[PDB]
């Protein structure tokens, strides 16, 4: 909506979408022993 909210991930795409798709596959495989999930912000939009 606003280019500064999409940059700071107030709105826009979730972490499955704006991150590099290899980092999503890395965090999906190493999740049980090295969690990268809380390092990235998911926008929830009403």
């Amino acid at each position: 909506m606003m280019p500064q909210w999409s940059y700071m991930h107030i709105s826009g795409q979730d972490a499955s979408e704006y991150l590099s798709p290899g980092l999503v596959q890395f965090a999906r495989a190493t999740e049980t022993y090295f969690s990268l999930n809380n390092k990235f912000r998911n926008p929830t939009v009403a």
Partner: peptide
């Protein structure tokens, strides 16, 4: 990245795709 995942059987035990980021705030 199946060489980083533990093997339950012979399939890589991967997480979900959309479980990458956090979204929790003080009531939102």
């Amino acid at each position: 990245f199946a060489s980083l995942a533990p093997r339950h059987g012979s399939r890589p035990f991967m997480g979900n795709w959309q479980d990458i980021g956090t979204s929790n705030m003080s009531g939102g």
